[PDB]
Design a protein around this ligand. Structure first.
Ligand SMILES: Cc1cccc(C(=O)NCCC2(CNc3ccc(C(N)=O)cn3)CCCCC2)c1
Ligand SMILES: Cc1cccc(C(=O)NCCC2(CNc3ccc(C(N)=O)cn3)CCCCC2)c1
Lengths: 244, 244
């Protein structure tokens, strides 16, 4: 159905095996629901030593991605993608990814993800080749590959058939606690409601737990929500119990 | 020197090749600055079909990590780590990772990272086995492996010898623009200051650019900082120019 194609520009394409060969995403690739295609700037070099880095104007330590091999790799990916491919640059300077952002990105049938190494890429390439800049969080990594892989995994969950944070009606809340066998573990028992077989009591317990957990751990997330009448009631109950 | 050991619990240990075999982190592993050791709950199963999932109490769709194989894997990792290993569970319900959090985690000589699959792990395991809960961002992935890999990469940058977001004195600000060859690219020129050879003008330009970029893209980050006199001045200059 709404299958997705993701082009990747990376000096380390074999890193992407972590998502293309394993788990739910691996199955998505095998079943042709998701296609990940990689281009390596090293393949676009022409000097004997296949140089992919270059010195920064203005000095300072560190190197940057060499423009020519990276530019040529991007152009080749764009040509293969055809029309409509959104080109994304992953860096801490980008729009912070959240679940709403994931759902926006998942609307695209084609994406090209540019993964930098070293200290960065030329600002003029960002101006001329990149459509959107995204960050997976406020921290610094050794390359854009893990961020790209994270984005791919997050959007892959929205492709029909692949499956069986933020935005019942619990979208926007933290997940509730989960329990499986055994009934008693290190003296700790499963909440009896979960054994009751009472589907409505269980639903309300889970929703109440999610509201309580969000209130205690991430109260700022609650402010972004328009709680339903039921959610307002269950949250009040949790707060009263917490205060008791 | 201050080398780091990271134990990992994962159903897909081969995913970790993405960080142990490539780039800066790959070199860190080869040079014994970083050691990543994996235990797979599947190896701790005893039934013919090596079952690693189990049904949730209370019903609902989805499965959870089976308790016994996961618990046994964790205990084995803890025994190997010896004393002082901090056990971390990666999920959206955890403390949000940022660069300050990375620096806190990097203080640990040993970490054990628990990577879940399916819909989660038993809440009582979180109570009894986990020291800290961390999230790499407000989005949902298919497993805890990419978050674990992200954390490892982020902390690896702090191990001496491995190298040559948030918290001069530019810590806390977004990165400045970078330029490399050629001097003119698609009609776009490198800022002349970067060619001036004037080290102090270049330093101030970069700092001003970082202040401007942080103000325009992430103004909330500026509020968390106590700007130096120089930073206050350069920010004012950037704001005046933006308003002109
Ligand atoms: C605030 C600050 C201060 C100092 C340097 C930087 C900086 O941007 N350094 C360059 C890092 C680099 C790759 N590493 C990444 C990529 C993406 C993400 C993410 N959070 O999505 C994290 N780290 C280099 C290759 C191009 C992309 C960026 C940022
Ligand atoms: C808000 C919300 C709503 C609904 C479900 C969940 C949920 O937690 N679902 C389970 C996901 C799972 C793995 N996926 C991950 C792991 C870590 C991260 C991260 N951001 O660090 C992201 N995704 C399952 C295995 C155990 C760990 C958690 C969360």
């Amino acid at each position: 159905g709404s299958h997705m194609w993701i082009g990747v520009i990376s000096l380390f394409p074999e890193m992407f095996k972590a998502i293309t060969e394993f788990g739910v995403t691996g199955r998505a690739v095998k079943h042709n629901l998701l296609k990940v295609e990689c281009w390596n700037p090293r393949d676009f070099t022409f000097d004997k030593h296949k140089t992919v880095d270059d010195r920064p104007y203005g000095g300072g330590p560190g190197m940057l991605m060499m423009v020519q091999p990276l530019r040529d790799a991007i152009h080749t990916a764009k040509a293969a993608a055809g029309e409509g491919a959104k080109v994304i640059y992953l860096s801490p300077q980008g729009r912070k990814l959240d679940q709403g952002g994931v759902t926006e990105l998942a609307q695209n049938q084609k994406l090209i993800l540019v993964c930098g190494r070293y200290e960065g890429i030329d600002e003029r390439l960002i101006q001329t080749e990149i459509d959107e800049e995204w960050s997976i969080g406020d921290y610094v990594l050794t390359g854009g590959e893990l961020p790209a892989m994270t984005l791919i995994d997050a959007v892959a969950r929205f492709i029909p058939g692949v499956l069986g944070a933020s935005a019942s009606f619990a979208d926007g809340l933290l997940d509730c606690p989960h329990y499986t066998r055994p009934e008693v573990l290190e003296g700790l028992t499963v909440p009896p409601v979960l054994m009751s077989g009472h589907h409505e009591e269980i639903r309300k317990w889970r929703l109440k737990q999610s509201l309580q957990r969000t209130w205690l751990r991430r109260p700022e997330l609650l402010e972004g929500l328009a709680l339903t009448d039921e959610q307002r009631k269950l949250l009040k109950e949790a707060q009263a119990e917490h205060n008791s």
